Design a binder for this molecule. Structure first.
Ligand code: MN
Ligand code: MN
Ligand code: MN
Ligand code: MN
Length: 89
């Protein structure tokens, strides 16, 4: 995983949000979190091959802090529908 992405993960706040792993400007995975810090840190110790792939292929991680878990739910759904990222089912 790129060092800048590891740094971004380790700095992420304990706040609800949506995250977007990207490569060459294109989203490759979009997810949401009750706490960005907790969810993103899980990518450092990959529990599945898919989590490993997302974290290796990405050249960028964007995070969006949201107002609450309701906003995380709808924003994540909207962005997955918009971008249909390769690793989202
Ligand atoms: Mn999701
Ligand atoms: Mn597996
Ligand atoms: Mn960007
Ligand atoms: Mn709420």
């Amino acid at each position: 995983m790129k060092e800048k992405i590891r740094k971004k993960i380790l700095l992420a706040p304990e706040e609800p949000g949506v995250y977007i792993f990207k490569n060459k400007g294109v989203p490759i995975y979009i997810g949401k979190a009750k706490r960005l810090s907790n969810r993103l840190r899980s990518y450092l110790n990959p529990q599945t091959e898919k989590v490993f792939r997302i974290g290796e292929e990405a050249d960028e991680l964007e995070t969006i802090v949201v107002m609450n878990e309701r906003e995380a739910f709808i924003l994540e759904a909207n962005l997955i529908k918009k971008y249909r990222p390769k690793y989202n089912v």
